[PDB]
Coordinates of C-alpha atoms and ligand atoms in Angstrom, one line a residue:
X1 CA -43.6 -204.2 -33.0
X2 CA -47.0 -204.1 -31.6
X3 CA -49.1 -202.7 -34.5
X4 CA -52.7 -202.8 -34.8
X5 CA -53.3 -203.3 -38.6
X6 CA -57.0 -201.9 -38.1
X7 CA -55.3 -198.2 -37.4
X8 CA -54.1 -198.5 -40.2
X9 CA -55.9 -197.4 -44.1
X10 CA -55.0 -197.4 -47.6
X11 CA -55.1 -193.6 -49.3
X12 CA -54.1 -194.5 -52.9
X13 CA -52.1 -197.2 -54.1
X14 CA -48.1 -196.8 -55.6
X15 CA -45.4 -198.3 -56.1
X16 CA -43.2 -198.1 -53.0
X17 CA -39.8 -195.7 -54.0
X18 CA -36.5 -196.2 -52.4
X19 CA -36.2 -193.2 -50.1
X20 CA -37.3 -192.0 -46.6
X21 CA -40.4 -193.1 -45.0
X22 CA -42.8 -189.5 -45.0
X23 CA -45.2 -189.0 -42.2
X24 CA -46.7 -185.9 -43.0
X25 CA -48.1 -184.7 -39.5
X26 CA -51.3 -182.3 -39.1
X27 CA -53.5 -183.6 -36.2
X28 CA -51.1 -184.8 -34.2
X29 CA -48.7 -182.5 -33.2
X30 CA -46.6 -185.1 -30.7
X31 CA -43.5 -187.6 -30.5
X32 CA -44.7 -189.9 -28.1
X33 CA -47.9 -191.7 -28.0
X34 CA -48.8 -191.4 -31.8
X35 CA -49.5 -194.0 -33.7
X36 CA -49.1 -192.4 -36.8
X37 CA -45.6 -191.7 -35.9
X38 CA -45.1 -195.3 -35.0
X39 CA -46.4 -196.7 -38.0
X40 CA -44.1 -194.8 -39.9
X41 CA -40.9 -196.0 -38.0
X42 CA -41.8 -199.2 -38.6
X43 CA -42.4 -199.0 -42.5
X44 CA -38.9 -197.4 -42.4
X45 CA -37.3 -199.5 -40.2
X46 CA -39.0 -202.8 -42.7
X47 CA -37.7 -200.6 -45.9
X48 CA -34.2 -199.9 -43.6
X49 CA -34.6 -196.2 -45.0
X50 CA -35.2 -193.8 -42.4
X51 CA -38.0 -192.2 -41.5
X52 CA -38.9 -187.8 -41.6
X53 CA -41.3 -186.0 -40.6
X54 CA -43.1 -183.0 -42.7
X55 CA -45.3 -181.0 -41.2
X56 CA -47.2 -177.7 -44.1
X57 CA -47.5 -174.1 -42.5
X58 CA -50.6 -173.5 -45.0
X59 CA -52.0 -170.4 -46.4
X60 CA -54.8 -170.2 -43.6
X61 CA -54.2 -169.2 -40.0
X62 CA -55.6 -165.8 -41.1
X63 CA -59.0 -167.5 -40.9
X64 CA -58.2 -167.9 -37.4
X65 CA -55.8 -165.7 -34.9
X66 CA -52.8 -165.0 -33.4
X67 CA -53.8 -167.2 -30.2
X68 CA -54.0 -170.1 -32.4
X69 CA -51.1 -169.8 -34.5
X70 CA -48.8 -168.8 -31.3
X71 CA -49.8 -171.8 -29.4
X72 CA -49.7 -174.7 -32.2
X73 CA -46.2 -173.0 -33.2
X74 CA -44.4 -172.8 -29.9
X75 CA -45.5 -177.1 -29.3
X76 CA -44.0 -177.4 -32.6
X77 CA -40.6 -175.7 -31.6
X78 CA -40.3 -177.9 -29.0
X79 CA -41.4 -180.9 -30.8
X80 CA -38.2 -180.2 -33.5
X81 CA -36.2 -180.7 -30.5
X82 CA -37.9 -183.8 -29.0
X83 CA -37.9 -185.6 -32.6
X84 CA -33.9 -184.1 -32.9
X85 CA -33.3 -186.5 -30.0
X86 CA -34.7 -189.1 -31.7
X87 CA -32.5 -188.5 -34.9
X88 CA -35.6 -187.7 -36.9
X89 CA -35.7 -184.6 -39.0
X90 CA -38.6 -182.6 -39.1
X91 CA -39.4 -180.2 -42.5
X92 CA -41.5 -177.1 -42.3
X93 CA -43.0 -176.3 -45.5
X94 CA -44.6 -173.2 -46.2
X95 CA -47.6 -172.7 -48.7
X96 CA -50.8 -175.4 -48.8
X97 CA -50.4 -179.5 -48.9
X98 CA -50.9 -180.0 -52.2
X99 CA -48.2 -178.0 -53.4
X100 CA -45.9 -178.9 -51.1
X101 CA -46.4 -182.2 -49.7
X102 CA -46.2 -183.1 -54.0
X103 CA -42.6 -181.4 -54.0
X104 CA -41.4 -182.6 -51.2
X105 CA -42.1 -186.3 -52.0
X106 CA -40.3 -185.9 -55.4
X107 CA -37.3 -184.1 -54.3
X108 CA -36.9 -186.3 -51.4
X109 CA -37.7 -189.3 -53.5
X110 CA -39.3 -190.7 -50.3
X111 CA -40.7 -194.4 -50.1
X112 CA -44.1 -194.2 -48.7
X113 CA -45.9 -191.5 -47.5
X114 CA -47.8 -191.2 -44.1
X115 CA -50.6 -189.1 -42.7
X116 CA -52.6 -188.8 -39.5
X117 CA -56.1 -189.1 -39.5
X118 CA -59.2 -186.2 -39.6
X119 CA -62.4 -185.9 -40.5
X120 CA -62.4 -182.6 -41.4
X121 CA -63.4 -180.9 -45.2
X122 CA -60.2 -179.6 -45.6
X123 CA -57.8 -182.4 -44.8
X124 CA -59.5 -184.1 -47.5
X125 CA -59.1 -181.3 -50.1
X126 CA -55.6 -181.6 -49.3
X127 CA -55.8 -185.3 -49.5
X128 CA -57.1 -185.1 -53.0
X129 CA -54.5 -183.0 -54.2
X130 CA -51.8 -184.8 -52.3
X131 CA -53.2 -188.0 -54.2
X132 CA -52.8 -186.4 -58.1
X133 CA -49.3 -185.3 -57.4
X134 CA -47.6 -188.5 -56.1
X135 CA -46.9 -191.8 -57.4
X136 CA -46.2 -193.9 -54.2
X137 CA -47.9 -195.6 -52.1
X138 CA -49.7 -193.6 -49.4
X139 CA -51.1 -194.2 -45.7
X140 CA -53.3 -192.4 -43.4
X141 CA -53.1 -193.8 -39.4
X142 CA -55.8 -192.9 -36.9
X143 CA -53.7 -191.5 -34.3
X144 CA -56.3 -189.6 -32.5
X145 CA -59.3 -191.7 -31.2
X146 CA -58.3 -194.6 -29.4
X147 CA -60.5 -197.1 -31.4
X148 CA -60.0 -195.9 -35.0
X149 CA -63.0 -194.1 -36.6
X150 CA -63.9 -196.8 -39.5
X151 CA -63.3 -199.3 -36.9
X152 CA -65.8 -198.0 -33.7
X153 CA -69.0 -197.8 -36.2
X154 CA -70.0 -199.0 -39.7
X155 CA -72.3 -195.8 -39.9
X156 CA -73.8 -192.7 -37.9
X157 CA -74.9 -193.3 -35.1
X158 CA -77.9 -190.9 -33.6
X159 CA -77.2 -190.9 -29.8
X160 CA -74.4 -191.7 -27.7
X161 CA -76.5 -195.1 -25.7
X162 CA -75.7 -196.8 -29.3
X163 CA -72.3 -195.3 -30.2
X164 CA -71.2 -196.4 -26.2
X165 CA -71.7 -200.3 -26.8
X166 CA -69.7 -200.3 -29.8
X167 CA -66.8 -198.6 -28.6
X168 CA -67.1 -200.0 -25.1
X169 CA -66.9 -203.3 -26.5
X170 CA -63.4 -202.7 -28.8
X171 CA -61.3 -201.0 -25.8
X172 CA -60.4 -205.0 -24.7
X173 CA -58.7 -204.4 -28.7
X174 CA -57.7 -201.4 -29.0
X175 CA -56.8 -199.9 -25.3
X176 CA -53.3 -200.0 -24.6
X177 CA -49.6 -199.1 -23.7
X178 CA -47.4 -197.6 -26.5
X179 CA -44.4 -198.9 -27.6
X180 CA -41.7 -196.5 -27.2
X181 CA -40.8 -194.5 -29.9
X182 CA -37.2 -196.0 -31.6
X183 CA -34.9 -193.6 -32.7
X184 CA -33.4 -193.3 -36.4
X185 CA -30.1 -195.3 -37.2
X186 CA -28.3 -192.5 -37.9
X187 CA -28.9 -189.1 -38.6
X188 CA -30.1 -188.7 -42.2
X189 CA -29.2 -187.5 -45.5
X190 CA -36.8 -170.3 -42.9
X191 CA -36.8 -171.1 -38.9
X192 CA -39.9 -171.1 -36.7
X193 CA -39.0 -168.0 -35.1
X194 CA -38.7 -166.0 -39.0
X195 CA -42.1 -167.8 -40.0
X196 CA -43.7 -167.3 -36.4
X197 CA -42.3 -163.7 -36.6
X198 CA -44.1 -163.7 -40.0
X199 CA -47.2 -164.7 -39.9
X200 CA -47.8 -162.7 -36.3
X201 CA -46.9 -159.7 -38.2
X202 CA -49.7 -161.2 -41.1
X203 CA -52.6 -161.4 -38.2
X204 CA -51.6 -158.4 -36.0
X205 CA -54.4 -156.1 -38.0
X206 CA -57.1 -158.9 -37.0
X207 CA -56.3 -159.4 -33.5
X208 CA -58.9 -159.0 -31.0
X209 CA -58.9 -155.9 -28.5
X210 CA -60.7 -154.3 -25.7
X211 CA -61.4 -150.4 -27.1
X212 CA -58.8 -149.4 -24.5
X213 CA -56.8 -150.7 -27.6
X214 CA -55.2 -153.3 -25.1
X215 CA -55.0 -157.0 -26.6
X216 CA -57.6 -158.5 -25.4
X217 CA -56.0 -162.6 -25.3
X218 CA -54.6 -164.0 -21.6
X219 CA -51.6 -166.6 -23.0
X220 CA -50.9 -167.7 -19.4
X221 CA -54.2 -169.8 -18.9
X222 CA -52.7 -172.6 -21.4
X223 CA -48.7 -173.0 -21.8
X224 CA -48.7 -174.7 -25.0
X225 CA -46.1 -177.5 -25.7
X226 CA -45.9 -181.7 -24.9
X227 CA -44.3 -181.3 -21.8
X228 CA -47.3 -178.7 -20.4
X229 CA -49.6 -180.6 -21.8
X230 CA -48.4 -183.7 -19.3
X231 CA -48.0 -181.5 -16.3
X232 CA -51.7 -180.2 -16.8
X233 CA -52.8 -183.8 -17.2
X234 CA -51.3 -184.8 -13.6
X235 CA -52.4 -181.8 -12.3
X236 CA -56.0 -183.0 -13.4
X237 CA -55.5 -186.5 -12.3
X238 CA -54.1 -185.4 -8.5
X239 CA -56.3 -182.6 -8.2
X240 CA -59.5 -182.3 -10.1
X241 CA -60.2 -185.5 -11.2
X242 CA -62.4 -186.9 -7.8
X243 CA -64.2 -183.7 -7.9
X244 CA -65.0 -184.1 -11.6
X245 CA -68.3 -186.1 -11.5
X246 CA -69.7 -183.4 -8.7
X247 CA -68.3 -180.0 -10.7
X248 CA -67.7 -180.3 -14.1
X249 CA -71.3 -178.6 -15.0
X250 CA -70.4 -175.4 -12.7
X251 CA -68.7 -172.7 -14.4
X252 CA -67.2 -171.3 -11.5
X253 CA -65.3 -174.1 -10.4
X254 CA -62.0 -175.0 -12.0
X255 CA -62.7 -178.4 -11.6
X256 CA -62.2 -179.8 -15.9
X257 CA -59.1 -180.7 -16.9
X258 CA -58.1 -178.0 -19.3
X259 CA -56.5 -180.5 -22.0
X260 CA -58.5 -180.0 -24.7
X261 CA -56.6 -177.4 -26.7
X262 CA -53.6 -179.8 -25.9
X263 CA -56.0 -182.8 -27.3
X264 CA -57.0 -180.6 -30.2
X265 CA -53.3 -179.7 -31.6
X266 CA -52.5 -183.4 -30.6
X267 CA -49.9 -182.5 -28.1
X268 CA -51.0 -184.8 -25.6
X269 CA -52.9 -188.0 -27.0
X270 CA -55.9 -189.6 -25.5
X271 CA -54.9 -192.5 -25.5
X272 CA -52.6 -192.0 -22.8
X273 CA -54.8 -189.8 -20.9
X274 CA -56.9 -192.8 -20.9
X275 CA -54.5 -195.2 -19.9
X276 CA -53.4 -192.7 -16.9
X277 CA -57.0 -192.0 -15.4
X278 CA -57.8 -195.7 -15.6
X279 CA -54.9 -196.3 -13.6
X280 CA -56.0 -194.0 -10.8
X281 CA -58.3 -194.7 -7.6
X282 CA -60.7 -191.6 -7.3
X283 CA -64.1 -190.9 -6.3
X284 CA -66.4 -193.5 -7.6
X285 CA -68.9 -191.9 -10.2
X286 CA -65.9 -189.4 -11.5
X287 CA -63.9 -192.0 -13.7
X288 CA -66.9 -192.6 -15.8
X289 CA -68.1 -189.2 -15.9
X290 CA -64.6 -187.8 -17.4
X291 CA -64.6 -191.3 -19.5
X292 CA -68.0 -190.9 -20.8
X293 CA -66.9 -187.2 -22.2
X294 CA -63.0 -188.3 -23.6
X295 CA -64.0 -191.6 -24.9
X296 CA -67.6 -191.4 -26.0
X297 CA -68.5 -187.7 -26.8
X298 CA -65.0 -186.5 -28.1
X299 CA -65.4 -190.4 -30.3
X300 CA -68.4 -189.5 -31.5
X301 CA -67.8 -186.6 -33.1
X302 CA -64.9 -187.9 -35.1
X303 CA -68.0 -190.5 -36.2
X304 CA -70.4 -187.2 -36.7
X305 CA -68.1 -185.6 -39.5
X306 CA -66.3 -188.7 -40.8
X307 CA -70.2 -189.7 -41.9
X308 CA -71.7 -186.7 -42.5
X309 CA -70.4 -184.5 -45.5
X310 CA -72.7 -182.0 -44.5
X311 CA -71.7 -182.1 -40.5
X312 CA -71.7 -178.2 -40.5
X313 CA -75.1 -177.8 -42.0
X314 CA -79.0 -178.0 -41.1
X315 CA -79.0 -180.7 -43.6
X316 CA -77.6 -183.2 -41.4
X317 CA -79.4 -182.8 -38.1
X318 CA -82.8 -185.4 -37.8
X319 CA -85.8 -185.4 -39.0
X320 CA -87.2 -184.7 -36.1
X321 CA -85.1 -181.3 -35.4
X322 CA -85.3 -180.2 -38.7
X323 CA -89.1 -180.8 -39.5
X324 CA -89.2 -179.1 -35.5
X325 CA -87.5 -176.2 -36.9
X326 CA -89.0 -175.6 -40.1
X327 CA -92.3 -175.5 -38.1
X328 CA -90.7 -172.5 -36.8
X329 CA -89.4 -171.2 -39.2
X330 CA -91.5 -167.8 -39.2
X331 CA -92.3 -167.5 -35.4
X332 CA -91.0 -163.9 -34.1
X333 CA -87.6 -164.0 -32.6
X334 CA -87.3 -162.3 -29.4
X335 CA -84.7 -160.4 -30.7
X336 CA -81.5 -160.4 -33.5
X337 CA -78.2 -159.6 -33.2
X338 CA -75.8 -159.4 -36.1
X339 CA -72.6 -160.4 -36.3
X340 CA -70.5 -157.9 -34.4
X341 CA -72.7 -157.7 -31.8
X342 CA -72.7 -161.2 -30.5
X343 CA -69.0 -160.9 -31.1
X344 CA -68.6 -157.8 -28.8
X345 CA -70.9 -159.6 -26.5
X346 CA -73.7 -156.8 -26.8
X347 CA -76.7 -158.3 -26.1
X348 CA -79.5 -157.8 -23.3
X349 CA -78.2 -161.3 -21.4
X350 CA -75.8 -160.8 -18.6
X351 CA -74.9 -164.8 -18.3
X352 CA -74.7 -165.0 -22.5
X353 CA -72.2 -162.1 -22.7
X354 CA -69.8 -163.3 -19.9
X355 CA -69.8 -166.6 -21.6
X356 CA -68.5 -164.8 -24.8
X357 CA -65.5 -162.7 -22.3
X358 CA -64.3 -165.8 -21.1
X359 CA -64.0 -167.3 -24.6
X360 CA -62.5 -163.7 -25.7
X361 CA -60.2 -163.4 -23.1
X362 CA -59.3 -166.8 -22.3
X363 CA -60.2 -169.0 -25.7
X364 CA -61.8 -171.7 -23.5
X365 CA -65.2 -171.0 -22.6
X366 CA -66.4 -173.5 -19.6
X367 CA -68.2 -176.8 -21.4
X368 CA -71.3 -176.0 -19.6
X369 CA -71.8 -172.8 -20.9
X370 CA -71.0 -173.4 -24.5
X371 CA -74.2 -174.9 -24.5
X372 CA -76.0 -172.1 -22.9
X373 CA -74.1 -170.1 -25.6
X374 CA -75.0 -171.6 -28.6
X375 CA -78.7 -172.6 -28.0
X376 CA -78.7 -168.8 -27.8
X377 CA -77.4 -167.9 -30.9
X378 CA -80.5 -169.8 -32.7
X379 CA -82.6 -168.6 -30.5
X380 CA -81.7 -164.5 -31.5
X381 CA -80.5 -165.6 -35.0
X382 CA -82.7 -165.1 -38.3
X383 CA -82.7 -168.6 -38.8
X384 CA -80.9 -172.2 -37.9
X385 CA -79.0 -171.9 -40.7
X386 CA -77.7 -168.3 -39.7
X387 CA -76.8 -169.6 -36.2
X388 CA -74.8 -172.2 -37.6
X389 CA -72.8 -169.7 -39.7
X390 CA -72.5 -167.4 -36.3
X391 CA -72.0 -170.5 -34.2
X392 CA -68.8 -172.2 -36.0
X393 CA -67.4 -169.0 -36.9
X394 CA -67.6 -167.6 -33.2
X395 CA -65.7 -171.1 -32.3
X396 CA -63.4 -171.3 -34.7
X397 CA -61.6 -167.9 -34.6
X398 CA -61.4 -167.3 -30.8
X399 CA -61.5 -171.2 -29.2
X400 CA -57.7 -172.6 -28.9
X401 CA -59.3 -176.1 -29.3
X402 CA -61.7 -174.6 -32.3
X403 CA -61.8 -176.0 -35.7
X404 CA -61.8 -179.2 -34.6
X405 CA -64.9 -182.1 -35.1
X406 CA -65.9 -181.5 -31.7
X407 CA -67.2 -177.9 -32.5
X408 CA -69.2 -179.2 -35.6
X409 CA -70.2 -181.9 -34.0
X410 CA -71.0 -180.1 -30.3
X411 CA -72.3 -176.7 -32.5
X412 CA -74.9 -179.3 -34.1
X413 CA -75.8 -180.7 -30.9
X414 CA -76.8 -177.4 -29.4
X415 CA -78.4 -176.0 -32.6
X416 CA -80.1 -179.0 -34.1
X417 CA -80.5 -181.8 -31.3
X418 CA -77.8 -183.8 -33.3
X419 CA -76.9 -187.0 -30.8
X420 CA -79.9 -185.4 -28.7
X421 CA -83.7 -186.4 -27.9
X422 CA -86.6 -184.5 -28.9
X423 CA -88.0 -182.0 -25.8
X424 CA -90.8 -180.1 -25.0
X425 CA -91.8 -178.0 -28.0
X426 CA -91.1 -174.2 -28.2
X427 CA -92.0 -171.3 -30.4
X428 CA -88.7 -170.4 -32.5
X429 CA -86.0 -173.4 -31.0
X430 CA -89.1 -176.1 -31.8
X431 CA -88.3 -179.1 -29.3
X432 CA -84.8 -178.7 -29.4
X433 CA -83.3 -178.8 -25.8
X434 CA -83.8 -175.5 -23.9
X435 CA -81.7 -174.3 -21.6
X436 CA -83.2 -171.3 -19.9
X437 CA -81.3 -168.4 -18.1
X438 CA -83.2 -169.3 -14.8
X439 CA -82.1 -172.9 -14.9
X440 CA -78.7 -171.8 -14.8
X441 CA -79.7 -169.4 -11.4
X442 CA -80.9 -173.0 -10.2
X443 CA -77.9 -174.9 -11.2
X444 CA -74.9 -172.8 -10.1
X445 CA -73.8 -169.1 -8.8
X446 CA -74.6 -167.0 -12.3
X447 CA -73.6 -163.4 -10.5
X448 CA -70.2 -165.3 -9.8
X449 CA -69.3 -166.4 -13.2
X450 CA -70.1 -162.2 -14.4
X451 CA -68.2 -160.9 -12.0
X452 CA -65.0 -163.2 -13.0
X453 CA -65.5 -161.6 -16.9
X454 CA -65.8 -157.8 -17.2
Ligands
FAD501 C1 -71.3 -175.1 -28.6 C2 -70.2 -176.1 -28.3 C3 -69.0 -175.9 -29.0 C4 -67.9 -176.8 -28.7 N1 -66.7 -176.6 -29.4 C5 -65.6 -177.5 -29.1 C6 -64.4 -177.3 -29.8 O1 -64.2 -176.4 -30.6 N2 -63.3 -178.2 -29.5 C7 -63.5 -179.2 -28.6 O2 -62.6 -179.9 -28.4 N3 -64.7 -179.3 -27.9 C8 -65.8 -178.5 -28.2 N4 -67.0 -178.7 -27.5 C9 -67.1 -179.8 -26.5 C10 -66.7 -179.4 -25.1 O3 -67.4 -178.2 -24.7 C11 -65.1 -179.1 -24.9 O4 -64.4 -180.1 -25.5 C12 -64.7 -179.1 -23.4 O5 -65.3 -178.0 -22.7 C13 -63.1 -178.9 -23.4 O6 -62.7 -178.5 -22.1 P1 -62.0 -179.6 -21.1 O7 -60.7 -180.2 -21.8 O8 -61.6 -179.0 -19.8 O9 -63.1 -180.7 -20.9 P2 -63.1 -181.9 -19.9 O10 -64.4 -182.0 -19.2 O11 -61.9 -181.8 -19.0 O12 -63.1 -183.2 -20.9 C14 -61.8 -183.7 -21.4 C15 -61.9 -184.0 -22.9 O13 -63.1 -184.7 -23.3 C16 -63.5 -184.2 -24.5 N5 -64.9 -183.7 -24.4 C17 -65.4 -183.2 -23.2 N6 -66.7 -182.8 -23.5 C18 -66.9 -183.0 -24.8 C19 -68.0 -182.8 -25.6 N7 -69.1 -182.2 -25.1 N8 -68.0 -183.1 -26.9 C20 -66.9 -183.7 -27.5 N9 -65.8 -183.9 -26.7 C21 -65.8 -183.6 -25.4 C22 -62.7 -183.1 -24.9 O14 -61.7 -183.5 -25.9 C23 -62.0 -182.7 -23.7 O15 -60.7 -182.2 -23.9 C24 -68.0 -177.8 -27.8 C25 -69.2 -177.9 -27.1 C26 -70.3 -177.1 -27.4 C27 -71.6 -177.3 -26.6
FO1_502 O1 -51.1 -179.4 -41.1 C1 -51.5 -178.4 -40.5 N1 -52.4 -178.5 -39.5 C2 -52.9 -177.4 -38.9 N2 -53.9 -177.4 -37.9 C3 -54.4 -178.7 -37.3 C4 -55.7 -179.3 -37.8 O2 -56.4 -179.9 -36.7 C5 -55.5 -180.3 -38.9 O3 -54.9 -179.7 -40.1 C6 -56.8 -181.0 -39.4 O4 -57.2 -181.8 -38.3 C7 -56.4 -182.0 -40.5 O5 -55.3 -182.8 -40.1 C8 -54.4 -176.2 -37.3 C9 -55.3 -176.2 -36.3 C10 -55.7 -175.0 -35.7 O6 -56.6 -175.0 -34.7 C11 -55.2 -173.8 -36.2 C12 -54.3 -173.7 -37.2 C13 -53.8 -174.9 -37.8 C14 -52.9 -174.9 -38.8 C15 -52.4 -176.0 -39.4 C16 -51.4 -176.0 -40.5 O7 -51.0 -174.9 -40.9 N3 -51.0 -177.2 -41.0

């Protein structure tokens, strides 16, 4: 076995029992290419016990929508297959971790227990719980970055030229091929359809529509699963990848690769992406422009929330942007929308509201344009504080790849210069980074990207 101990950290201590080897899976909704997953075979196979999977459908979902739940669900219908091939049972338990997870350990009177790894508030509050009602030893694997988050930096880090060396200089370590996946010995020792069914019927009242009373979500744009989430990386590879470094900041190309909902459920992992476009011979310039973004920047933000408790509030941005921003505290804002009307994409900007109908209808709005988007909401908010509110909540119901440490940490950028310079000073946004209306009509084809969304 080829096993990086450094991927590898301690939850709580136990003593080990003398069942199945648990990995409880959450980010990292994949068979192959998962460290997590392969840290757990092994355990097992060193234990000769076999190894299950346990994966909590939690009482939340109806903080987000049906485009979420449909999509994470139908990879994970595929993935009981994929892991049936391997002889390794997958459990779906309904209701929140600690609960569950607690249960399921003592009825299965499983070994060790094994988790991925995420930054996020509310892995952790499961964590905690998870921790009083267990007794065995128990593992969390980073099976999401490619150099492991407590590994890349000791502490935040402020920009990206400072985070980049670091990481840069452990890919040598930590940048490499899988081992394939070994099966179970033997096969060991209520279905997604009733609890998709379910939970559909539980978020129908809450789905989005255009007043035509229409839905208002396109599913087509993104076939969720592990095997579409390959085909879209080749795709990107053969076909968008040398234009990449050129296109990627103009909205009316389809010129990204479209993998991060995939990247956010974990049904495709980076590090293979990696791997793959390293492999390839494209356009100079492109490589390290797609590199910079799915190493550095998606990295990063793992780093942003893993060391900031505060990640999705004014309290953590810099001194600079928040002294900046108190300045302006009480300068006039141009105008206010609330809620609703940001939502329904009401406001007097042409380019802003067609940002928010692509993220409606699609639930990927173009990268470029999320910034435009955001760095408007503080502009016609009542305060920074507000925007973040409108900001992550905006993201995080209609995004596919929403709720994820690249939203806090890329909502933060916008908002409060997080991983950002100080710019020229403004009335309201301070010297946080402006990006005008009439720097997009310089930088790409504006009427264009309307016309695609109404
Ligand atoms: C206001 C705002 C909100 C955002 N919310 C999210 C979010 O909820 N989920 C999310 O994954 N990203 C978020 N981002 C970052 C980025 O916009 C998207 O990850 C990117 O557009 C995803 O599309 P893609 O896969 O085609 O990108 P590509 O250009 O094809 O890049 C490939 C991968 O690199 C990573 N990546 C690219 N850009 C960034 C970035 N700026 N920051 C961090 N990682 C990046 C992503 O994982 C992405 O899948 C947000 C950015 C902003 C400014
Ligand atoms: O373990 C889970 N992970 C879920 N995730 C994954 C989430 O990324 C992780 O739970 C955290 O990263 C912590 O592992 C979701 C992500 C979404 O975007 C939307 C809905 C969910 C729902 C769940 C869930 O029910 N259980």
């Amino acid at each position: 076995s080829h096993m990086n101990p450094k991927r590898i950290r301690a939850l709580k201590s136990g003593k080990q029992g003398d069942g199945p080897v648990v990995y409880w899976m959450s980010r990292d909704q994949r068979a192959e290419d998962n460290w997590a997953l392969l840290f757990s075979r092994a355990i097992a196979k060193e234990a000769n016990v076999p190894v299950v999977v346990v994966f909590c459908l939690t009482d939340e979902f109806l903080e987000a929508g049906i485009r979420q739940y449909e999509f994470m669900l139908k990879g994970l219908q595929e993935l009981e297959v994929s892991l049936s091939r391997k002889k390794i049972p997958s459990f779906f338990l309904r209701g929140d971790p600690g609960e569950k997870i607690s249960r399921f350990v003592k009825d299965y009177n499983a070994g060790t227990l094994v988790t991925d790894f995420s930054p996020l508030r509310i892995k952790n509050q499961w964590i905690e719980k998870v921790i009083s009602g267990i007794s065995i030893p128990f593992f969390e694997v980073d099976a999401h970055n490619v150099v492991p988050c407590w590994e890349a930096s000791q502490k935040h880090e402020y920009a990206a030229h400072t985070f980049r060396p670091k990481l840069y200089a452990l890919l040598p370590e930590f940048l490499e091929e899988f081992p394939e996946l070994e099966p179970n010995s033997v096969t060991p020792e209520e279905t997604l359809s009733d609890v998709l069914e379910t939970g559909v019927k539980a978020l129908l009242p809450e789905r989005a529509l255009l007043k035509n009373k229409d839905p208002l979500f396109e599913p087509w744009h993104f076939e969720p699963g592990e095997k579409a989430a390959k085909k879209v990386m080749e795709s990107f590879i053969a076909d968008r990848l040398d234009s990449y470094g050129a296109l990627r900041n103009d909205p009316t190309k389809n010129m990204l690769s479209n993998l991060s909902p995939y990247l956010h459920f974990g049904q495709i992992s980076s590090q293979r992406v990696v791997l793959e476009v390293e492999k390839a011979e494209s356009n100079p310039g492109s490589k390290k422009a797609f590199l910079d973004e799915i190493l550095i920047w998606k990295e990063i933000s793992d780093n942003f929330c893993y060391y900031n408790p505060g990640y999705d509030g004014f309290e953590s941005f810099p001194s600079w942007a928040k002294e900046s921003l108190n300045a302006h505290r009480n300068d006039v804002r141009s105008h206010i929308y609330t809620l609703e009307e940001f939502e329904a994409g009401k406001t007097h900007d042409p380019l802003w509201n067609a940002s928010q109908m692509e993220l409606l209808s699609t639930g990927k709005m173009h990268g470029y344009t999320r910034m435009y988007w955001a760095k408007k909401i503080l502009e016609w908010s009542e305060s920074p504080e507000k925007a973040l509110e409108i900001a992550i909540c905006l993201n995080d119901r209609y995004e596919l790849d929403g709720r994820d440490p690249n939203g806090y940490a890329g909502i933060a950028w916008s908002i409060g210069g997080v991983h950002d310079r100080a710019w020229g000073e403004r009335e309201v946004t301070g010297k946080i980074r402006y990006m005008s209306y009439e720097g997009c009509k310089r930088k790409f084809d504006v009427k264009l990207y309307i016309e695609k969304y109404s």
